[PDB]
Symmetry: C2
Subunit: 440 residues, 2 copies
């Protein structure tokens, strides 16, 4: 392991190097290009499909280089020594295929969505055996990072005085041309935009579900958005974010739920970053502080196992090997060590209904395997799902499976039916909790 | 900011990131005093940092220009007295214990009106700080190879067989079990945790100390589980909230301090389960709840006065962050009226966490002549209990395990539930 602000030279024998470098300095473009120029074959991994496809187009337009591009929706093979791929497509491709790459760049290695973590873990477990010389863990914001001040951005502490209440402070009359306003939830987007629209401001709301097309492509506007997202004259930031957490609630087992926390440094820099691009921008904030970057929640580990089982045909023990490699590697975001627990949970979930899994994968549920497995248990007990929320629509053949209480394995959302807590799988998960979660 | 802030011309709040060395309560305050300024230095404690030696409050070290005190004494003294000091140094301002947070918040809210010219927020570990290497300490990852299982890894007998070693576990139960395993292998292992003191052989024979963070000789190596137990609040709606303890990865302050009990003078070895840590700079909402509790129980502070001090804290950049629940907690404690003064006196004197919350739950039990949620030691102010053995507990909130059956219909419960829906986002 090594620490760099400049591209690590290819060593003679295998090594993992940390690259901490600004976003503009072309981690995903100049770095792989300089490696390609030395004659190496380079894989560049990114969380985002749009980023991945976007690097292909840039390299073509700016350098007449047509890289291979590998994403879920689109795959291009040119034979270039440079390959751009998403973490998710990399995992679908089986991970590291022997002899293909000399160098693997794990870009935005600070990313803590499940795909990045399983993806980087997989690279770390497999790259050396596959014949890679160098693995580069690249990010502009390593663990512990805090937001630094931006030359072109005015940062203005908010206060009490204004004609709209904003998160314990106030958004004043005046300074809402084109502005972006970050709220933590969809409903406070709608309610703040319904307020601004009735106030005569051309304000429109965005969040997941809505399509970006609904946003006024230039011309005076005030956008009220979650993180689920042109450039603006200023950014206004509630400084909080809604994140997914697991609660070991013992009712009977665990709960996946959401929590509102102060934003971490990655959130703040990004939200701030939507202004001041070339032209001087202004940043308004409810709160002066922020969590440092570099932690993620145990619920993301659950996701990795869910995706391993649902998308990538990994036995839980195989997903554990990849994730263990991630957690044994220094300089990466950290999480509770719950690998044994989640491996245990998922290993106990046998003979899932393949049709139900296909539907939950199709409909884009957050834990397709967990959802399809609960529905599997419900159908075979001829019991109802835990609610009739759209999450459970693979059971719409409702009419027979109404017999009584729900055999509740875990809580993935609100539970509305009456429940029974003595299913063998429920008891199995409880035993895994006693076995693998540390007490006190 | 790496060196003492020059005294400004109008009131300012400066920060001092100083090295792990070059003390900020000992060399830095002297330089301010040599310029005619009256300096107040606040720390969590004025016991010598080593654990041995003079108190910092020692006369010469008295009509002197430098006063050494604590956040706890400062709050009990009523905060800032008018015109008493030019410079107030809030040292160790990364501390996220309730007393430190309420104390610093008080300094920030009051200093300028008291005529201070400068407030210095000094720490060796500003928010985002990560553990840095140590010239004198070799660090080695534990593998899965070894006789002694240890948090998913293993300790080889060789690295602790003979010599003097310190091993951190996250709980008493874990220390007992590990010590037992080691003794059964012919190791001289002693367990240490809250309430023992001296069984750690003051000798320097071979020994393996298995300990929590309760620990106050010296060691050839440290082995770290890299986890800690912390107090958290759960908004569980059963009926209201729960103060509970949970296990979490250690942060950089904890890692640095644990690792630091080896490599004192002679070289040392640090062996770890996890290569990483939580970065420092965040604390739980339950600490805010503690501030209001302590405000009501100890400092004669109306909730709105606690809010003012806490708000000053949260408006100041460079300090640990927390969820903005001031309005929620202020609202909760505002509703808690007519506490029985005699139960409060007892929960205060027994050293319980949340004495105001314990005594208030007890008060509500005595009036409805209902039993406490359990008979754990927490509820002993009620021990004259034969009358109030009747019926379910009017449960306000959960401060521990609940064994009696409960009613959720008390007005105070409803009130706190409503505060949750309106002041948080948790219905
Ligand atoms: C909604 O999809 C997901 C959502 C979450 C996760 N996860 O947390 O790991 C993984 C996936 C699966 N996934 C995420 C990507 C990234 C991308 O869209 O480029 C991807 C890409 C390809 C495949 C894939 C494609 C085929 N033909 C077959 C299989 N088994 C997977 C699955 C892929
Ligand atoms: Ca809970
Ligand atoms: Ca919870």
């Amino acid at each position: 392991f090594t620490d760099n602000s400049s591209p690590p030279a290819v060593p003679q024998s295998f090594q993992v190097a940390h690259l901490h470098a600004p976003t503009g300095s072309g981690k995903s473009t100049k770095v792989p290009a300089a490696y390609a120029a030395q004659g190496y074959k380079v894989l560049v991994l990114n969380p985002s499909v749009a980023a991945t496809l976007g690097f292909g187009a840039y390299m073509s337009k700016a350098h007449g280089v047509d890289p291979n591009i590998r994403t879920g929706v689109r795959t291009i093979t040119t034979g270039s020594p440079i390959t751009y791929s998403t973490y998710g497509k990399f995992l679908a491709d089986g991970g590291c295929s022997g002899g293909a790459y000399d160098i693997i760049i794990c870009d935005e290695c600070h990313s803590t969505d499940a795909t990045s973590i399983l993806g980087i873990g997989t690279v770390l477990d497999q790259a050396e055996t596959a014949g890679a010389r160098l693995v580069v863990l690249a990010t502009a914001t390593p663990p512990g990072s805090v937001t630094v001040s931006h030359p072109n951005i005015e940062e203005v502490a908010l206060s009490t005085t204004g004609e709209i209440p904003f998160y314990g402070k106030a958004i004043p009359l005046e300074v809402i041309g084109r502005h972006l306003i970050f709220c933590h939830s969809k409903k406070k987007c709608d309610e703040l935009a319904a307020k601004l629209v009735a106030l005569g401001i051309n304000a429109v709301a965005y969040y997941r579900g809505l399509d970006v097309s609904v946003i006024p492509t230039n011309g005076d506007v005030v956008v009220v958005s979650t993180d689920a997202l042109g450039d603006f004259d200023s950014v206004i930031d509630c400084n909080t974010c809604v994140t997914q957490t697991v609660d070991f609630s013992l009712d009977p087992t665990f709960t996946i739920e959401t929590t509102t926390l102060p934003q971490d440094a990655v959130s703040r820099t990004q939200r701030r970053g939507r202004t001041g691009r070339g032209k001087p921008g202004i940043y308004r904030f409810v709160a002066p502080g922020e969590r440092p970057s570099g932690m993620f929640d145990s619920s993301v580990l659950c996701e990795c196992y869910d995706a391993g089982c649902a998308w990538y045909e990994l036995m839980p023990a195989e997903t554990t090997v990849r994730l263990r490699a991630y957690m044994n590697t220094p300089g990466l975001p950290v999480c509770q060590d719950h690998l044994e627990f989640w491996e245990g949970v998922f290993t106990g979930l046998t003979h899932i209904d393949a049709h139900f899994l296909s539907q939950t994968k199709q409909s884009g549920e957050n834990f397709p395997y967990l959802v399809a497995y609960q529905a599997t248990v419900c159908a075979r007990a001829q019991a109802p799902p835990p609610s009739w929320d759209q999450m459970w629509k693979c059971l719409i053949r409702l009419k027979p499976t109404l017999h009584g209480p729900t055999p509740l394995l875990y809580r993935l959302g609100a539970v509305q039916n009456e429940v029974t807590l003595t299913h063998p799988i429920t008891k199995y998960i409880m035993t895994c909790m006693s076995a693998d979660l540390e007490v006190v």
